Enzyme design. Structure first.
Site, PDB file in Angstrom:
ATOM      1  N   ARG A 136      16.999 -38.024 -19.228  1.00 26.03           N
ATOM      2  CA  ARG A 136      17.085 -39.455 -19.492  1.00 26.03           C
ATOM      3  C   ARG A 136      15.693 -40.066 -19.567  1.00 26.03           C
ATOM      4  O   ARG A 136      14.924 -39.974 -18.603  1.00 26.03           O
ATOM      5  CB  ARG A 136      17.872 -40.133 -18.358  1.00 26.03           C
ATOM      6  N   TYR A 191       6.762 -41.315 -11.895  1.00 26.48           N
ATOM      7  CA  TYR A 191       7.276 -41.251 -10.526  1.00 26.48           C
ATOM      8  C   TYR A 191       6.651 -40.120  -9.699  1.00 26.48           C
ATOM      9  O   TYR A 191       7.363 -39.355  -9.058  1.00 26.48           O
ATOM     10  CB  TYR A 191       8.795 -41.047 -10.530  1.00 26.48           C
ATOM     11  N   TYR A 234       6.277 -47.337  -6.885  1.00 31.09           N
ATOM     12  CA  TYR A 234       5.985 -48.424  -7.801  1.00 31.09           C
ATOM     13  C   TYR A 234       4.676 -49.095  -7.404  1.00 31.09           C
ATOM     14  O   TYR A 234       4.136 -48.822  -6.335  1.00 31.09           O
ATOM     15  CB  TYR A 234       7.126 -49.443  -7.802  1.00 31.09           C
ATOM     16  N   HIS A 279      15.246 -38.319 -14.815  1.00 30.49           N
ATOM     17  CA  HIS A 279      13.946 -38.684 -15.391  1.00 30.49           C
ATOM     18  C   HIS A 279      12.941 -37.566 -15.120  1.00 30.49           C
ATOM     19  O   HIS A 279      13.049 -36.863 -14.103  1.00 30.49           O
ATOM     20  CB  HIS A 279      13.387 -39.965 -14.756  1.00 30.49           C
TER      21      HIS A 279
HETATM   22  N1    C Z   1       5.815 -44.377 -10.251  1.00 32.09           N
HETATM   23  C1    C Z   1       6.327 -44.899 -11.367  1.00 32.09           C
HETATM   24  C2    C Z   1       7.155 -46.019 -11.326  1.00 32.09           C
HETATM   25  C3    C Z   1       7.665 -46.556 -12.507  1.00 32.09           C
HETATM   26  N2    C Z   1       7.326 -45.955 -13.727  1.00 32.09           N
HETATM   27  C4    C Z   1       7.839 -46.466 -15.004  1.00 32.09           C
HETATM   28  O1    C Z   1       7.906 -47.914 -15.019  1.00 32.09           O
HETATM   29  C5    C Z   1       9.095 -48.247 -15.829  1.00 32.09           C
HETATM   30  C6    C Z   1       9.977 -49.206 -14.998  1.00 32.09           C
HETATM   31  O2    C Z   1      10.447 -48.596 -13.782  1.00 32.09           O
HETATM   32  P1    C Z   1      12.057 -48.380 -13.488  1.00 32.09           P
HETATM   33  O3    C Z   1      12.787 -48.051 -14.903  1.00 32.09           O
HETATM   34  O4    C Z   1      12.364 -47.332 -12.468  1.00 32.09           O
HETATM   35  O5    C Z   1      12.514 -49.846 -13.014  1.00 32.09           O
HETATM   36  C7    C Z   1       9.757 -46.892 -16.171  1.00 32.09           C
HETATM   37  O6    C Z   1       9.135 -46.320 -17.335  1.00 32.09           O
HETATM   38  C8    C Z   1       9.301 -46.054 -15.017  1.00 32.09           C
HETATM   39  O7    C Z   1       9.399 -44.669 -15.354  1.00 32.09           O
HETATM   40  C9    C Z   1       6.510 -44.843 -13.764  1.00 32.09           C
HETATM   41  O8    C Z   1       6.240 -44.332 -14.844  1.00 32.09           O
HETATM   42  N3    C Z   1       5.999 -44.310 -12.593  1.00 32.09           N
END
Ligand code: C
Ligand code: C
Ligand code: C
Ligand code: C
Lengths: 258, 258, 258, 258
Positions: free
Chosen positions: C128, C155, C161, C187
């Site tokens: 995904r 991630y 984050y 992911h």
């Molecule tokens: N540590 C992280 C946190 C978020 N992100 C990216 O930031 C975007 C927003 O985060 P979420 O979809 O999990 O809400 C996504 O592309 C997520 O993969 C990332 O690349 N690495």
């Protein structure tokens, strides 16, 4: 072209043929094929069937055509988009089960004023026009301007069709035919007449009556005498009962009935 | 262009290649990839899969393409908009689950007369055309005018495909393959022939037969000898069974099967 | 215009601002507003929210705008037309509950090849793409040609984050945030990179990396140094948790969640 | 043309007729016909009915028209495409049950900004504009530019309509009228005023107040004095209660209520 719209009342057998227009299309409905003679020829522009037995009528019509008893260009289901009058899935999947037919409502609803007229009387007053009147509305939507009526007699003294409807297959499919009065209680002379008058006035078309001895002639002016000829062709060894599809066919259609 | 439409009957292995047209597209269906040699090359214009195993065939096709065993431009699901033939949600959400594929019915239904012909025979008489005939209809809707047929043999003496279909994965997904006669009882030679004749006459296209020793040749004229060449490329270590998606994949698709 | 697409990874805080293009639009997603400083300014061209908390994010966004913390032209729900990813009624009634927002899929599906790429990997391999990649696809469909990426870090070492997501309201709405790894197991770095590479090559657009110390820079070329200036505006007394609608609001929306 | 939009508050009876514009259309809603005199004439451009009693109001309206008590060109149902505000099947089949009427939302939704404004306040804050404000929105979508308001009084000191609503039939259909405060708790003066101000500013139309002694006049400028004349025609033996369709009618409509 002019169109002849035929109910299946007794006056179907008392057309004044000297008044038959020169060049016309013919609309027939329901058990029209029970007729003992070709009172209007074997060529139909359209045949109309009620939703309730559409599945069996379509099957039967194919046999009639294969048998060269009748021809028809259009096959119409006389629907209204009303849950109490027709099966919802039947209507939704119609063109996929019957790709060479039409939902009559595709045309009926083009007459907004008449659609509104019908629905109000049906829903609130239980006053329901008959198939003959429905065919008139569809004729108007299709662009016909001169409409010659026959076989419309308002179910006087029973349903009294122009033929014997007490046939084994029809009786089994539709037990209401077992009794002398088998049609909807909500039909009446006034309802049909008022509707026809609404249509004529609203859409500025012309209605004529082909049957001078029918009660219809008290309300609609006679088609002009033209001194036309007509030889009524007899029927023998003809299809005079509806056909019943196999149980496998019913199974495939089971989502679309009841 | 001209199109070669291939069933998977034994005659797939007895094409008279001197009659192969010069410039053609190829339509294959179902377990075509079980073939032991590239009887029609590895390049397909379209591949057609029945609704029943579409989910696994799509998965398998992606592996075939990734593996460079076959190429194809179009991926078709051979649907009919009939509840008894296909899952309703599957059809409704199709373009969202398989965005690079097509519902074959998008094209089949453009042939109104043939749609009507098919439905009447299927629903009322349980006479069902085979995939090869369905591909012909879709070919016609797409604008093809000259259709060369092969691998159509009417399931003589069992289903007898041009390859061994008794493979573990296919047998588990579709237990009907466990027995010698695994196809729909409603298929027949006459049904396929009558349908093909209807199509040819109705849409004024031309049908040819590529397999002179097939029973098909008793009904359809032979493709002209052109003295064409063809080297049948062998297959080894090839995909000869359908692939089974993971249980997580099935879970995501669960609204779209059964 | 050029667009800056921002994930919420740690690199959001390590943009090399000398590489910021002169005239750009900004795309933000999800909990972007948890950021402690305006790393990309308070003006967004679009904000994207996942279907799962769309109801609360929309509410929260209105408060942010009313509060003059952020502005945005477009509000997008990042949907896919997949039953396992989103509530069906939510999608069907979307424009009636959120008339100034958009379903992102209205745009995503315009990229047929990428729609197909996504669905196949998601459905069959449980691979995904992340929101950041989804925003890229929508950017391309909207006609953007130069895409500058930041905050995409795959991630590493937990969800990690660029802000603290362990906030009372978010934890109650989405308990997955209670644990260090709260994102979808499906992911991965390779999945995001392969998807981005597919998009760049397929739609002939250009991808740049704004964060030289991010792992993203091993795969995507750096945005050119332009000697641009940027003063990071601080935030205080800002909205750093999602807001929870009243129980009456939930009741009105109850057909559209779960 | 200019339009006069009339709520049914007490100020309906205190219009300053010297300010009545020269050439106008009239919009009425709900129990407008309970009025004891023709405060705005018997000719309506449109009448608006809430979804909840639409079935009975439509029936009643037909009687009013047949009775020559009122005329109207347009019949509107004041819907919003919200499950909590209206029956879903009712809305889906509307044009088939009421072919000469309209869903007001067909027009309301053309005002995107106002649709968004309404939904956000309704869903999240339970702040619901009244019918009078809804008619204004529909007026704007229809192209009206000058809007003269009357009968809008914000339900001061009870629902206090300009007529007696405690009538046997209305009380049976809608028991909420049994109590002095029968309207939605979510209505308020501020909500109506803020909405009207949003509309005026957003769509650059003009609002006027026809009732100088109404609280509305504290917010909306007075229609200019033109020295217009108006003789209020009295009503006697008039329809002052809603009519109740037969149990057969309810049965036919049963899928469309509750
Ligand atoms: N540590 C992280 C946190 C978020 N992100 C990216 O930031 C975007 C927003 O985060 P979420 O979809 O999990 O809400 C996504 O592309 C997520 O993969 C990332 O690349 N690495
Ligand atoms: N005695 C009869 C029988 C049928 N008819 C008309 O013939 C048409 C077809 O009959 P049915 O709709 O009942 O099948 C209808 O208009 C019906 O009212 C008639 O007018 N008088
Ligand atoms: N023995 C066989 C096997 C398959 N076929 C045709 O090959 C096509 C593909 O086979 P299936 O639809 O059974 O998958 C069909 O037209 C089928 O009838 C045939 O004509 N004779
Ligand atoms: N006392 C009242 C009664 C009705 N009205 C308005 O008249 C219109 C029609 O009344 P109802 O929507 O309650 O049927 C609404 O705008 C309502 O708010 C008013 O403003 N003050």
């Amino acid at each position: 072209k002019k169109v002849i719209i035929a109910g299946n009342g007794p006056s179907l057998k008392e057309i004044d043929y000297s008044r038959l227009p020169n060049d016309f299309d013919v609309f027939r409905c329901n058990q029209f094929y029970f007729e003992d003679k070709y009172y209007l020829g074997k060529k139909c522009k359209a045949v109309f069937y009620a939703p309730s037995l559409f599945f069996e009528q379509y099957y039967t019509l194919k046999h009639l055509i294969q048998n060269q008893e009748y021809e028809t260009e259009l096959i119409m289901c006389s629907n209204y988009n009303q849950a109490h009058l027709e099966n919802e899935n039947f209507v939704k999947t119609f063109y996929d089960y019957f790709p060479d037919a039409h939902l009559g409502y595709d045309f009926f609803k083009q007459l907004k004023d008449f659609n509104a007229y019908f629905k109000f009387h049906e829903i609130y007053f239980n006053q329901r026009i008959t198939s003959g009147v429905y065919m008139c509305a569809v004729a108007i939507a299709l662009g016909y301007k001169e409409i010659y009526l026959s076989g419309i007699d308002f179910y006087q003294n029973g349903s009294s069709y122009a033929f014997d409807t007490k046939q084994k297959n029809l009786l089994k499919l539709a037990p209401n035919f077992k009794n002398d009065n088998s049609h909807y209680i909500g039909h009446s002379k006034n309802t049909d007449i008022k509707a026809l008058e609404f249509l004529e006035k609203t859409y500025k078309i012309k209605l004529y009556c082909l049957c001078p001895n029918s009660l219809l002639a008290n309300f609609i002016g006679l088609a002009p005498n033209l001194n036309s000829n007509f030889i009524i062709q007899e029927k023998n060894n003809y299809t005079k009962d509806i056909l019943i599809p196999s149980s496998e066919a019913y199974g495939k259609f089971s989502k679309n009935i009841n």
